[PDB]
Design a protein around this ligand. Sequence first.
Ligand SMILES: O=C(O)CNC(=O)C(=O)O
Ligand SMILES: [Mg+2]
Ligand code: NI
Ligand SMILES: [Zn+2]
Length: 331
Amino acid sequence: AQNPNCNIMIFHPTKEEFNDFDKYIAYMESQGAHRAGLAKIIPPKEWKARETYDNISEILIATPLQQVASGRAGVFTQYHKKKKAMTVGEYRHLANSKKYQTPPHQNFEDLERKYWKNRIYNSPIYGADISGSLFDENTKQWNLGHLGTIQDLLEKECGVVIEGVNTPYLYFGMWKTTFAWHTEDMDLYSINYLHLGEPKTWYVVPPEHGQRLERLARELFPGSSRGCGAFLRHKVALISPTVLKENGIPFNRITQEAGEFMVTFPYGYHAGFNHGFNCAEAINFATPRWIDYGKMASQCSCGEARVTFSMDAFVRILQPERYDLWKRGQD
Ligand SMILES: O=C(O)CNC(=O)C(=O)O
Ligand SMILES: [Mg+2]
Ligand code: NI
Ligand SMILES: [Zn+2]
């Protein structure tokens, strides 16, 4: 078995190997990359996402989210408070202000310490989940707006044509902006490209150990757990690396820098934070190996998780027994 310790693997495809996305994902899996739950892909030196980032300031963040924490430094939840619209230019200025800017630090490790120590005492503002793309239409390789769709994959594997579309999202981040512990909708893959700015630190639990994370989370968030059998779908809970180590949960960590791709694999729980002003683009995708995960994915039916139009058909076709209860949650 390849990669039996479930370490995060880092790939350096050549320009030739960067042509066929599906084939390269399948290559990574042949080397065991999926066992970690997350891989890093460094694009060939010849490649670029677009020519420059000099003209992005007029993009609108219609609903910036202020991430307010409750709990203790290592075990907390966050809720999102809606703020007034602002442009990317306005947001970048706010990120760089004395109130929100990254503190002085020595290295990534020092910054990570400062994050876990101090995150709860501040409420950073995240521009998340903005439909759109920063890839140039002429970028042919690993263009996240031109991937094969999940609907077409389900059709190719299972023969059923379904409604729905699959498009990318932009994330504008600042110091301490946080992504809570989650897997993707329907335990899909994700791919994330850091277009510009400061790094993003990730933590991940191997898919084969995801249930260990879930059991810890039920112990650490006992009211949430009683409210919903899949409350990590709410994307509100944070657990620090110190706390995971104390409880014997297997995980790994890696820092993503500008120009790098991360791929999350089905049922790979992940969480993390942004180091400073940045912009990432991400999208879900599927492969033939996903289908079995989609069939087994947990669902939130308490009504909190409320998700895209396109998840309907996935539940309907892959989880017909669950469909009725799940749709009651959506309505
Ligand atoms: O970048 C972020 O805030 C969160 N991204 C993801 O969880 C992802 O790409 O799967
Ligand atoms: Mg603009
Ligand atoms: Ni994710
Ligand atoms: Zn729920």
